[PDB]
Design a protein around this ligand. Structure first.
Ligand SMILES: [K+]
Ligand SMILES: [K+]
Ligand SMILES: [K+]
Ligand SMILES: [Mg+2]
Ligand SMILES: [Mg+2]
Length: 51
RNA sequence: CGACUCUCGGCAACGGAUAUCUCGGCUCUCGCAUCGAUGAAGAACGUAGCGAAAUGCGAUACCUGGUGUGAAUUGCAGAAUCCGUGAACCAUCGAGUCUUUGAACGCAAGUUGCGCCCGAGGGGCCGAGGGCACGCCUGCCUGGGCGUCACG
């Protein structure tokens, strides 16, 4: 396919950027235990974000 | 005299009739002609400092932009703004955005399951982003058959 015009002309922007992936951290008592016991941060993340 | 039953009146209950209403209904008349593969109608999930629904909107998410008007919104709180490119849960619309779906279109489907191609940008690797259904029309490219021939 070598089209005579592009069907989409908008570049296409990454709407699932880092600010959508990392919404906010968890601050519950269980989540705070993970910080000093297992060097772990708990985050609320987007549903579309994989590991 | 007392209890019980029945009965008459006064006050208090129970219940929601009556009366007066009404941003609703019903009937009639008029004007207009505008949905969708440029993805509709419908369905799902999200979205507010405090929201569940209804209403609105779509990761730009009770809204962005333009224009108009011209000082509010308010249930609470905080911010912004005022002789101004300037408040508004204001009006209107030409600029935008518009998740998962659905005629629904890579293949499926009680699955966010199973594939292939291109590709900014940082040989290979990692990519943001995007393509790949069916029928049909015009043109085009690559082909098949001694089907009809011509010359070698
Ligand atoms: K009585
Ligand atoms: K009445
Ligand atoms: K399967
Ligand atoms: Mg509303
Ligand atoms: Mg489908």
């Amino acid at each position: 396919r070598d089209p005579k015009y592009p069907r989409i002309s908008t570049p296409g922007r990454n709407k699932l950027d880092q600010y959508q992936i990392l919404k906010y951290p968890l601050t519950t008592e269980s989540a705070m235990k993970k910080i000093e016991d297992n060097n772990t941060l708990v985050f609320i993340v987007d549903l579309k974000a994989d590991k």
